[PDB]
Design a protein around this ligand. Structure first.
Ligand code: CL
Ligand code: CL
Ligand code: CL
Ligand code: CL
Ligand code: CL
Ligand code: NA
Ligand code: NA
Ligand code: NA
Ligand code: NA
Ligand code: NA
Ligand code: NA
Ligand code: NA
Lengths: 496, 491, 126
C-alpha cells in the first residue's frame, strides 16, 4: 500500500531540511573565502552528515544451555561522531537489519540535537528472538556482544554509550556494564558510564522509567499552552476539558496517560495489539495500570466499554501513537479526528500522512522532539556515572536549611514590624513546597532538568517554524534545527 | 574476657535474618529453590576477603643501614570500585586483623550509602623508632608496591589515614602515585583521601568523624520511640555524657554535643581521668592538652580513679582502643547509651548484656562512619578538580538577598508608604551562614544528611524484624542487603 | 491441523459439545473464521474438491496454523510439527496430540515452562 522503509523516510526528512537551511549556513559562515567556496563547504558538510560514518556487522558464537553451538548476527551503526560519545539503543528482534539500524541511528543524531544532548547517533540490533532463548542464554549473548563491540570501538564511555530498546531492558544493560567494566574497561574509572538504562544498584539514574512518558507530557504542554498555535487548531489553550487517546499501553503510553490525567486531561480510549477499550467520561490510569499488570492485558476493563473500531480514528482532541512504525498512513490519515497527534513513538506517521495532516490543519509533534525524554535523561545518567555521585547528595540539606532560613527571616522581620506586642506571623512553606522539601530526591532534579529541556527545545522549534513560516509542520522545523546544530560543530572544527 | 573476629558472627547472624527477604525480591527467571541457592551463594562470596596482598619492601635508614619491612593490604569486596580503607603503622598488625577491619569497612560504607569497597593496609613498624625522612621512604615505597599490584588507584583502591598515620603520610602517598604509575592519570590525586588542603584535601575532614558521632546520637536521642524504652526524655536537654579517650574523635564529639546542651561529666585517657559533675568545657580542655601531653591535672576537674567507662551519666562515648566494654564490666555500666566512637569497642557478650539491660548501643558501622562519608566527598572533590561552592556561593548569596528584597518591595507596595518601611533581613543564624559560606558548610551539611537518612534505614529494619534496641544487627542487615542487590543484579 | 480421518471427527465431536473451530489447516493451505466453522460443511467441501482451500464460509489464513491464537491445538497430521522453533510462539494452552509424536522433546520442555497442557499421544491417540 503506502508504507515505505524508515531508511527512506529519514533521508527524505534530511534532504528537505538541508535544502531550506542551506541559505542560512552560507551566510553565517565566517571563513576567509568567497561565497562560492562557502556554499561548497556548506553543501559539502551536508554530504557528510547524511550517511552513517561507521557500521559494524558482527557474527559471534555462543554455547547454549542444551550444549549446541549457535552463531549470532549483530549490527551497530554509528551515524555521526561530531560529538563523542555516540548514543543509541540495542534492539533484540529478528526484524533487525543494516538499513534499519542505520536509519534509527540517523534519527538519533537529529533527536539529540533537538534536545541539545551532546551525543552522536547510534543504533544496535541482533537477529535473535528473546523468547527462544533462556535467561542464561540471553546473558551470554549480551556479554559476548559487549566484548566484540569493545574490541572494535563501538562501546565505551567516550566512544559509544548504548541504551535499552526493543526486547531489552535494565537486565541487559547491567550485563553490558559488568562485562565492559570487568574486561576491556577494567582500568577505566568511568567503566560503568559505558551504558545507560542500568538499574539503580548498577549506576542507573532515578526517574528513568517515567522519563519518556514525562517528555511526552511536557512536549505537548508547551504547545497546548501556546495561544498562537492553539488558535489554529480551534481549541482553547490548556489541558482542561481536553480528551486524549493513547495507542499502546506499554511504558511510554502508561506514563503519558498518567501525567496527562494528572494535569486535567481525560483519557477516553486506550488500544493495543490485543484490543481497544473506550469510555467517554475518562479512564483512570492507576486502575488501568493495575489491570494491565494483573491480567497481562487491558481487555475486560470494568470501567471501560470495548471499542471494536480503529484506535487511531477515535474522536478526541489529542492522539498519542506509542507502539509500532507507520501507524498513521495515507489511507487512514483523512479519517482521524484528533487535532493534535503526539508521536510517543519513533516514526509512527508516513510522510504522505504528514501531507494530509498538514492540509487538514492537524498539529503533529514530531518524534525527534517528543520521543526524546528518555534520551535526555540518559544524558543525565551518563553524567551521573561520570560524577560518581547522585544528584543532590551534597546539596539537599544545605538548600533545605537555607530555605527554612529565608522563611524564618521574613517571619522575624514581619514580627518586629507588626507583632511587637504579642502574637506570631508564621511563614511556613506551601503544601506544594513542603512535598518538594520533604520528599526531595534525585528524581526531582532529573525531572526538572527534563522539563527545562523540553521547554527550551520547544521555543527553538517554534522560532524556526515562524522564521521559514512552516505553520504546523514542526517536523521540518525540528530537522532544520538539528541540521544547523550538527553543521555548526563541523564548520567550526576545520578540515582533517 | 577478650574476643577476636566478631565480624564473622555479625555477618552470619545478619545473613540468616535477611535471607528470607532476599529470596522474595529475587525476580530472576529461576525456581524458588534455585533462588535460595543464589542467595546462599552470593553471601558466601561477600563474607571472605576477595584479595589480600602481603609485601616485604626495603628501605635505607639514615645511618646507611638496610631493613626489610612487612606490609599487608586486604581488599574485602569489590562490588563497588574503588575500594576504601586506612593504613595502620603498628607492630601489632596482622593479616587476620586487616582482613576483619576491611570487612567492617565494606558494611560501614553500605550503611552510610558510600559507593566504595572495604579495604585496609598495615605496615609492621613502630613509627617512633623511625625518623620523618625514614617514615617517608617507607611510605613512598609502600605506595609503589601497592600501585604495581593494583592495590591503590583513583578507580582501584583509595587508602586513608588510620593509626599513627595522617595528612603527612597521605600527601606522600598522593605525591608518589602522581609522579610514577599515575603520571598520565588526570585524577591521580584522588588516589588517597585525608590529604592536606594544599595537597587536594577537603574542608571539614578533621571534625568529620566527631561531627558524625554527634548526628548519630542526635537522630536517636530525639526519637521518643526509642527514648521511651530507655526511659529518658527526648533531646539533649539536661544530659551528661562521658567521653572515653580524648583523641580526635573524642575532642570533636565533645565540642558538638556540648554546643547543643550536653554536658561533659568526665573524660578518661590511657593515663588518667578527670571528673566534674557541673560540666567540663571542651575548649578549655582542648587548649590544655594542646599545651601539654595529657588531660591529667586539669584544673577545672578533680582527678577520677576507677573505670572511666562506668561513670554515672547517660551517654558513654568510647573513642579509644578496641574491646573496652566486655562481659566482665558489662553489668557495671552506669550510662544508658553506648555511642561507639571507635571500631568495635564492645564485645558480643556485652551486646547481649546491654540488650537485656535495655541499654541502647549505637553501632560502630554507623556512628563511626562520619569520616568515611567525608572521605567520599574528598574523593569526589579531586574528581571535580574544584572546591564545593566555588561556582555557586555568590550566585546563592545574591539569590537570598533578591528573595528577601522581593518580599520587602512586594509588601511595601501592598501596605503603602505611610505606615513606614518593612525591612526584611536574614536571621542571626542566616547571616552568619551566608557571610561565612565555605566548603566545610556544604560537607558538614551533606554529612548530616547522610547520618539522618541512614538512621531512618536502621530504625526501619530494627522494627521490621523486631530487633528492639539491637541496631547493630539492623545495621548489618541493611549493609548485607545493599551489597547483595549489587551482586544479584549484575549476574 | 490436518483435515484427515482424525481431524474430521475431532472437530465434529468438539463442535457438538459447544467448542468453536476457528481454523483448519492442511498441507496445501489454512482457512480461518473466528465465528466457527461447520464440520459438516467443511467435510462435504473436502470430499468434493479434495482440499479445504477456497471455503466459502471462511477466509484464507496466510500464517502458521499452529501459532493461531486459540485455546486448544490439535496436531493431527505429520510428525514433529512442534519443535523448539515454533513452540515458544504457540498461543494455545491445551495441545491434544492427534498424531504419533508431533512434539519434539525440546518443545515439551518449554511447553511445561510456559504452563501449556500437552495431552500425550500414547493416551489420547489410542
Ligand atoms: Cl524530499
Ligand atoms: Cl493549591
Ligand atoms: Cl577546615
Ligand atoms: Cl537581628
Ligand atoms: Cl504466555
Ligand atoms: Na556469565
Ligand atoms: Na573501573
Ligand atoms: Na554512580
Ligand atoms: Na511590587
Ligand atoms: Na562558622
Ligand atoms: Na451446537
Ligand atoms: Na528436541
Amino acid at each position: 500500500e503506502d508504507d515505505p522503509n524508515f531508511f527512506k523516510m529519514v533521508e527524505g526528512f534530511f534532504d528537505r531540511g538541508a535544502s531550506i537551511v542551506e541559505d542560512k549556513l552560507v551566510k553565517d559562515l565566517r571563513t576567509q573565502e568567497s561565497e562560492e567556496q562557502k556554499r561548497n563547504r556548506v553543501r559539502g558538510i551536508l554530504r557528510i552528515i547524511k550517511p552513517c560514518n561507521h557500521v559494524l556487522s558482527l557474527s559471534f558464537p555462543i554455547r547454549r544451555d542444551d550444549g549446541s553451538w549457535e552463531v549470532i548476527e549483530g549490527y551497530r551503526a554509528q551515524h555521526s561522531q561530531h560529538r563523542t560519545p555516540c548514543k543509541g539503543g540495542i534492539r533484540y528482534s529478528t526484524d533487525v537489519s543494516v538499513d534499519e539500524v542505520k536509519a534509527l541511528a540517523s534519527l538519533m543524531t537529529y533527536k539529540c540535537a533537538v534536545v541539545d544532548v551532546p551525543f552522536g547517533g547510534a543504533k544496535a540490533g541482533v537477529k535473535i528472538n528473546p523468547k527462544n532463548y533462556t535467561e542464561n542464554e540471553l546473558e551470554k549473548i549480551t556479554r559476548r556482544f559487549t566484548m566484540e563491540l569493545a574490541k572494535k570501538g563501538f562501546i565505551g564511555p567516550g566512544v559509544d554509550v548504548p541504551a535499552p530498546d526493543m526486547n531489552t531492558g535494565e537486565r541487559e544493560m547491567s550485563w553490558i556494564a559488568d562485562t565492559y567494566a570487568s574486561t576491556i574497561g577494567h582500568y577505566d574509572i568511568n567503566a560503568h558510564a559505558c551504558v545507560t538504562g542500568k538499574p539503580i544498584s548498577q549506576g542507573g539514574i532515578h526517574g528513568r522509567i517515567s522519563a519518556t512518558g514525562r517528555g511526552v507530557f511536557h512536549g505537548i504542554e508547551n504547545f497546548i499552552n501556546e495561544a498562537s498555535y492553539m488558535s489554529i487548531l480551534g481549541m482553547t489553550p490548556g489541558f482542561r476539558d481536553k480528551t486524549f487517546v493513547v495507542q499502546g499501553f506499554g511504558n511510554v503510553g502508561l506514563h503519558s496517560m498518567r501525567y496527562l490525567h494528572r494535569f486535567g486531561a481525560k483519557c477516553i480510549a486506550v488500544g493495543e495489539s490485543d484490543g481497544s477499550i473506550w469510555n467517554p467520561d475518562g479512564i483512570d490510569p492507576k486502575e488501568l495500570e493495575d489491570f494491565k499488570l494483573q491480567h497481562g492485558s487491558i481487555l475486560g476493563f470494568p470501567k471501560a466499554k470495548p471499542y471494536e473500531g480503529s484506535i487511531l480514528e477515535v474522536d478526541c482532541d489529542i492522539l498519542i501513537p506509542a507502539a509500532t512504525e507507520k501507524q498513521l498512513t495515507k489511507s487512514n490519515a483523512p479519517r482521524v479526528k484528533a487535532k493534535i497527534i503526539a508521536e510517543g513513538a519513533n516514526g509512527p506517521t508516513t510522510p504522505e500522512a504528514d501531507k494530509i495532516f498538514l492540509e487538514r490543519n492537524i498539529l503533529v509533534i514530531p518524534d525527534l522532539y517528543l520521543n526524546a525524554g528518555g534520551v535526555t535523561v540518559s544524558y543525565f545518567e551518563w553524567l551521573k556515572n561520570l560524577n560518581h555521585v547522585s544528584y543532590g547528595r551534597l546539596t539537599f540539606k544545605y538548600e533545605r536549611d537555607s530555605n527554612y532560613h529565608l522563611l524564618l527571616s521574613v517571619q522575624e522581620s514581619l514580627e518586629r514590624k507588626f507583632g511587637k506586642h504579642g502574637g506570631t506571623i508564621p511563614i511556613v512553606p506551601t503544601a506544594e513546597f513542603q512535598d518538594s522539601i520533604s520528599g526531595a530526591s534525585e528524581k526531582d532534579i532529573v525531572h526538572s532538568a527534563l522539563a527545562y529541556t523540553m521547554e527550551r527545545s520547544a521555543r527553538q522549534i517554534m522560532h524556526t517554524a515562524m522564521k521559514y513560516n512552516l505553520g504546523l509542520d514542526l517536523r521540518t522545523a525540528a530537522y532544520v534545527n538539528a541540521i544547523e546544530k550538527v553543521f555548526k560543530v563541523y564548520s567550526e572544527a576545520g578540515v582533517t
